Design an enzyme around this catalytic site. Structure first.
Site, PDB file in Angstrom:
ATOM      1  N   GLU A  11       0.756  -1.226   0.000  1.00  0.00           N
ATOM      2  CA  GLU A  11       0.000   0.000   0.000  1.00  0.00           C
ATOM      3  C   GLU A  11       0.793   1.287   0.000  1.00  0.00           C
ATOM      4  OE1 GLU A  11      -3.760  -1.899   0.368  1.00  0.00           O
ATOM      5  OE2 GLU A  11      -3.078   0.181  -0.079  1.00  0.00           O
ATOM      6  N   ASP A  20      -6.881   6.735  -4.471  1.00  0.00           N
ATOM      7  CA  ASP A  20      -6.404   5.396  -4.689  1.00  0.00           C
ATOM      8  C   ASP A  20      -6.501   4.951  -6.146  1.00  0.00           C
ATOM      9  OD1 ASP A  20      -8.905   3.363  -2.955  1.00  0.00           O
ATOM     10  OD2 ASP A  20      -8.922   4.448  -4.821  1.00  0.00           O
TER      11      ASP A  20
END
Ligand SMILES: [Cl-]
Ligand SMILES: [Cl-]
Length: 162
Positions: A11, A20
């Site tokens: 991540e 994202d």
């Protein structure tokens, strides 16, 4: 290697609000703030999560705090989920980390839906599960991360992460 490091690799860390891969507002180590298109709404969720007026920016410690909560929450979610729990209990330590990863990323529900792969994991048919896991939007959208997760289920080692 462990779950925290693994996920930290998948991540990254951003101390400033960002979007994202889906275009959703996120901060820290993959902490989704909101699916809403509004930065304001995002900032407001952030401030509520941190407990202060952040103005869209947080410190490393803050980010790590969100991360610990999020991991804790994911394991607990698996453990309460009727379809997931059994999969999880049937697995070894490494593969358990692979399942937590998918849940942290896609949510419980999301994961609860790979019904066929779950059965395969429970029967320990590694190669088969890996193939089936690949036929998914998940794999098509984030192919490199997905391959790392799938190799972990296939092999039972941390090799994809070395
Ligand atoms: Cl929160
Ligand atoms: Cl990817």
């Amino acid at each position: 290697m462990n779950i925290f490091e693994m996920l930290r690799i998948d991540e990254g860390l951003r101390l400033k609000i960002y979007k994202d891969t889906e275009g959703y507002y996120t901060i820290g180590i993959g902490h989704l703030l909101t699916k809403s298109p509004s930065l304001n709404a995002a900032k407001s969720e952030l401030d509520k999560a941190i407990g202060r007026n952040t103005n869209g920016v947080i410190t490393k410690d803050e980010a790590e705090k969100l991360f610990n909560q999020d991991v804790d929450a994911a394991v607990r979610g698996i453990l309460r989920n009727a379809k997931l729990k059994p999969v999880y209990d049937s697995l070894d330590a490494v593969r358990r980390a692979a399942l937590i990863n998918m849940v942290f990323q896609m949510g419980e529900t999301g994961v609860a839906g790979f019904t066929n792969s779950a059965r395969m994991l429970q029967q320990k048919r590694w190669d088969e599960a890996a193939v089936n896991l690949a036929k998914s939007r998940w794999y098509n959208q984030t192919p490199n991360r997905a391959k790392r997760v799938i190799t972990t289920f296939r092999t039972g080692t941390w090799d994809a992460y070395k």
